[PDB]
């Protein structure tokens, strides 16, 4: 179900893919949600979640690796983390 | 020639049916072909239901039954006379025999 | 003879034929 | 410690005696299976790679898992040179002349 919600958000809404974009969006306060893949290094995870704690942003832990997060986003590359900037037709922020 | 329109089994609209072992000889027989009898017998014969009821510490105690479902192959059943060879015209009758 | 055992016999005779020709290649 | 591992635990580098720092199941692909415990006598029964059952102190230690590098014997050496290089860093036991040929 979350795959369908994520596909709808990627298709209609706004997002950034990648650690540097996610951290920039957390610094600027433009992030509504940060999704982190399961096989992300723990040091990077605990740093993303310290940024999210400071920014008051929810964190969703994807159960698959960055290969499955990449194919969920409809991408042909790997996505270690991503931030949802604007949930459009989806309700992921209201469901997570 | 063809002896039975059902081929002696009960497989129609089906490819394969998992087998069962004959109770008497342990022969692998398809589940639909096996001769199956459901028996619910008293565990104590009526001769001994009296002395066992008097020896019972419970007044008005019902003796439990023994429930069993027996599976026979065609050879097991014919040998034990569970089923018998019937005439050509009498083979078609599918009502249960009227004995019980 | 039984057809199945006759078939096994013929298989054994083909085996012998094959080995005999293989002897001289 | 062996007593801290439930029955059926696959364990490796197990101590025969408390403190010898590992004796059993040390070669590639090998391990020791913990069969059961006898808490009254403080003993544990294990099954060794040879198939033997042994009784060890429950205070003896072991490492959880299978020794790495397994499946090595599955490939043929294919060559005398391969056996030569195998024993060049083990010891002088190869090649072997048959005693009947002496």
């Amino acid at each position: 179900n979350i795959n369908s919600k994520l596909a709808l958000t990627i298709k209609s809404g706004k997002y950034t893919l990648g650690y540097k974009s996610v951290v920039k969006s957390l610094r600027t306060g433009k992030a509504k949600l940060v999704i982190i893949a399961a096989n992300t290094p723990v040091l990077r995870k605990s740093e993303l979640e310290y940024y999210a704690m400071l920014s008051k942003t929810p964190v969703y832990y994807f159960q698959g690796g960055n290969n499955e997060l990449g194919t969920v986003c409809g991408k042909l590359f790997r996505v270690g983390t991503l931030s949802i900037l604007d949930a459009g037709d989806s309700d992921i922020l209201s469901s997570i | 020639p063809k002896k039975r329109a059902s081929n002696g089994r009960n497989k129609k609209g089906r490819g394969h049916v998992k087998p069962v072992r004959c109770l008497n000889c342990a022969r692998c027989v398809p589940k639909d072909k096996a001769i199956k009898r459901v028996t619910i017998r008293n565990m104590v014969e009526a001769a001994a239901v009296r002395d066992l009821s008097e020896a019972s510490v419970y007044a008005e105690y019902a003796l439990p039954k023994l429930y069993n479902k027996l599976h026979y192959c065609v050879s097991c059943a014919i040998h034990a006379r569970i089923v018998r060879v019937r005439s050509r015209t009498d083979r078609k009758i599918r009502t249960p025999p009227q004995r019980k | 003879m039984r057809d199945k055992w006759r078939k096994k016999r013929v298989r054994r005779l083909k085996r012998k034929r094959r080995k005999v020709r293989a002897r001289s290649k | 410690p062996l007593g801290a591992c439930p029955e059926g635990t696959i364990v490796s580098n197990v101590e025969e005696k408390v403190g010898d720092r590992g004796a059993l199941g040390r070669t590639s692909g090998n391990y020791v299976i913990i069969i059961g415990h006898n808490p009254d006598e403080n003993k544990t029964r294990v099954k060794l790679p040879s198939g033997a059952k042994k009784i060890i102190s429950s205070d003896a230690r072991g490492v959880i898992g299978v020794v790495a590098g397994g499946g090595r014997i599955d490939k043929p050496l294919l060559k005398a040179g391969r056996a030569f290089h195998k024993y060049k860093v083990k010891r002088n036991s190869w090649p072997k002349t048959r005693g009947v040929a002496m």
Binding site: - | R21, C25, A26, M43, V44, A48, A55, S56, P64, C73 | - | -
Partner: protein
């Protein structure tokens, strides 16, 4: 006021076990088999041998003090036959007729969910 044991009677088609334990079943009080009372294998499972064995079991149990038993009849079970042997009924009637008191009777034949292959082969045992 009575003291209950558990009379675990195992009646197969080759022998008959009359095994009297306590209520818990960890303590055996008397175990006389039908093969201990006759010298022919063909009649180790006879009703006569099972009844005599049960009567001797009752006599030995009484002098130890067990005054009542619950009955747990069983057949061989497993992949083999599920019907109790001919001697279990005679050993039960003999126990009832020997002055010992009988409580509940239950069948505890081991019945597998499905199974684990049965001996005899695909074509069964011929003869």
């Amino acid at each position: 006021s009575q003291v209950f044991g558990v009379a675990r009677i195992f009646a197969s088609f080759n022998d008959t076990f009359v095994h009297v334990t306590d209520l818990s079943g960890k303590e055996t009080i008397a175990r006389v088999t039908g093969g201990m009372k006759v010298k022919a294998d063909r009649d180790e499972s006879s009703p006569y041998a099972a009844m005599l064995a049960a009567q001797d079991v009752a006599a030995k149990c009484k002098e130890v003090g067990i005054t009542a038993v619950h009955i747990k009849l069983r057949a061989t079970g497993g992949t083999k036959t599920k019907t109790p042997g001919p001697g279990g009924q005679s050993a039960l009637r003999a126990l009832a007729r020997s002055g010992l008191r009988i409580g509940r009777i239950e069948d505890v034949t081991p019945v597998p969910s499905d199974s684990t292959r049965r001996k005899g082969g695909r074509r069964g045992r011929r003869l």
